[PDB]
Scaffold this active site. Structure first.
Site, PDB file in Angstrom:
ATOM      1  N   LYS A  14      44.631  34.091  52.954  1.00 44.37           N
ATOM      2  CA  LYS A  14      43.517  33.299  53.484  1.00 44.37           C
ATOM      3  C   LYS A  14      42.611  34.163  54.329  1.00 44.37           C
ATOM      4  O   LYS A  14      43.015  34.651  55.371  1.00 44.37           O
ATOM      5  CB  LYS A  14      44.010  32.101  54.317  1.00 44.37           C
ATOM      6  N   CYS A  32      27.834  35.255  56.086  1.00 37.94           N
ATOM      7  CA  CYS A  32      27.914  34.817  54.703  1.00 37.94           C
ATOM      8  C   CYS A  32      28.841  33.616  54.454  1.00 37.94           C
ATOM      9  O   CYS A  32      29.949  33.542  54.970  1.00 37.94           O
ATOM     10  CB  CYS A  32      28.383  36.019  53.873  1.00 37.94           C
ATOM     11  N   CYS A  34      28.846  32.582  50.998  1.00 37.86           N
ATOM     12  CA  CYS A  34      28.848  32.626  49.530  1.00 37.86           C
ATOM     13  C   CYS A  34      29.867  33.596  48.943  1.00 37.86           C
ATOM     14  O   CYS A  34      30.083  33.603  47.731  1.00 37.86           O
ATOM     15  CB  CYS A  34      27.439  32.987  49.008  1.00 37.86           C
ATOM     16  N   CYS A  43      25.959  38.323  56.150  1.00 35.42           N
ATOM     17  CA  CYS A  43      25.105  37.961  55.026  1.00 35.42           C
ATOM     18  C   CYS A  43      24.157  39.136  54.767  1.00 35.42           C
ATOM     19  O   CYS A  43      23.585  39.682  55.709  1.00 35.42           O
ATOM     20  CB  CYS A  43      24.346  36.678  55.364  1.00 35.42           C
ATOM     21  N   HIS A  47      23.280  35.788  48.633  1.00 36.80           N
ATOM     22  CA  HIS A  47      23.236  34.378  48.257  1.00 36.80           C
ATOM     23  C   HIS A  47      22.041  34.069  47.340  1.00 36.80           C
ATOM     24  O   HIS A  47      22.154  33.217  46.458  1.00 36.80           O
ATOM     25  CB  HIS A  47      23.212  33.445  49.501  1.00 36.80           C
TER      26      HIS A  47
END
Ligand code: FES
Ligand code: FES
Lengths: 68, 67
Positions: A14, A32, A34, A43, A47
């Site tokens: 995880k 992020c 995505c 990020c 995306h």
């Protein structure tokens, strides 16, 4: 029932990232959501290509820190 | 070539959420990166069901205040 994360730390059961607020130096920082960023957990704009390709509408979480 | 977000705010072309750090009330706050939370943008543990169903390993971003 499709995977969301294709490439990040697949050996890890995880992937959870922590941000210690006191370490944020920028007034604005994008993280992020995505799983395609090459600088994950940050990020990097990846995306946008995902959204164009799949017709999705994902975007980042922006952490805002006021100037003291 | 498959969607990440299936149901959140589909009328919005790009879902971006801003968090005002100075206003975090909890010392530890988890934010969703799986797009399944019922309290989105907060994480409600829905990633666990996603991971079990799909075999994925996604989890939240956790913001922590100074000790
Ligand atoms: S690169 Fe993943 S949300 Fe921007
Ligand atoms: S509910 Fe989405 S990451 Fe936890």
């Amino acid at each position: 029932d499709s995977l969301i994360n294709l490439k990040i730390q697949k050996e890890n059961p995880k992937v959870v990232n922590e941000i210690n607020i006191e370490d944020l130096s920028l007034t604005k920082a994008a993280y992020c959501r995505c799983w395609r960023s090459k600088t994950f957990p940050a990020c990097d704009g990846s995306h946008n290509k995902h959204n164009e390709l799949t017709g999705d509408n994902v975007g980042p979480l922006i952490l805002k820190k006021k100037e003291v």
